[PDB]
């Protein structure tokens, strides 16, 4: 049970693993930094994340403890899976850094969009495999609220993991608010502060899908400010009944400022596939109440090559109800201790 630990240092900062993980190569953030590594017992190659001082606050003690229970309730094809979780401390009291250590597959789309051609067939796949993924995500009551390109890895036989639960947990009625990457960002999470919902994400595919399809970033937005305006210039100004909804005042004053834009028409920026264009202007609307469902999304003719009701899964529920309470660091350290320990290998 208990193995040896060897301690190596990177970047200034200790890294305490297993003999079974060798060779770690870095590849850094505010809330973890993540290291490549060889898995001496699969005989696979393997990603390392050291959570940088999980307990220092409340905030970051709630994103270790979700992350860890999410990946090990999460169990699909295309989600990522947790291969080992360890600690060096031998004791609660000791408990300090969590690791985990998951696959690692080819590259990202990221760095793969960067010298590769792609074709419509593989878009086809890839966003297919995103949305089967986020079905059985959002069927536990799961919001990733982080879809990017980087959070997507990818092999040659284009079979692709969702990445990264550490911004996601279960789905509740008021969340953290400044959440995502700005330039796959949903308008809901800048206007409608901190009551948005799980369409989020489909914004966030809806930006994939474009983005593989012309090759470059839909809504290269310098700031906040840029990215409304980049968005606008494309789905068009809202309209009163809309912005009644809004519950920022603000936000509607500044929409209203603007020069008003319409909806550019979708077959005239994407002059592509018809079926894709039809898609995306499915998943990119303002109105999240009459936005495309992954579920919904799956049965799209776009698919049809790929699409199929019997294989596409669904989860069981999530249970929060440890989180649902206000409890002090040391009851969520416990709760990650106890999550931990608990922990057996897959197969």
Sequence with gaps: ERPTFYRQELNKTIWEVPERYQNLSPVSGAYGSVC????????????????????QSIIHAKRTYRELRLLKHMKHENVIGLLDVFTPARSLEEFNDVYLVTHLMGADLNNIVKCQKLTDDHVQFLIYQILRGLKYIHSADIIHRDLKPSNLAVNEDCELKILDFGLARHTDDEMTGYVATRWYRAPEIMLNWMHYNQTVDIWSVGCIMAELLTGRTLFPGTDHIDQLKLILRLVGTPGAELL??????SARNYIQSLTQMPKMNFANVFIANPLAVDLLEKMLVLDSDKRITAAQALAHAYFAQYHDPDDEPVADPYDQSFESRDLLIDEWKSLTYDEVISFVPPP
């Excluded at 590594?37 to 001082?53: E, I, M, N, P, W």
């Excluded at 009644?244 to 005042?249: D, H, L, R």
Aim: proline content about 4%; overall charge positive.
């Design 36 to 55: 490549a590594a060889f898995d001496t017992k699969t005989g696979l190659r393997v990603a390392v994340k050291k959570l940088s001082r999980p307990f």
């Design 244 to 249: 009644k909804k809004i519950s920022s005042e």
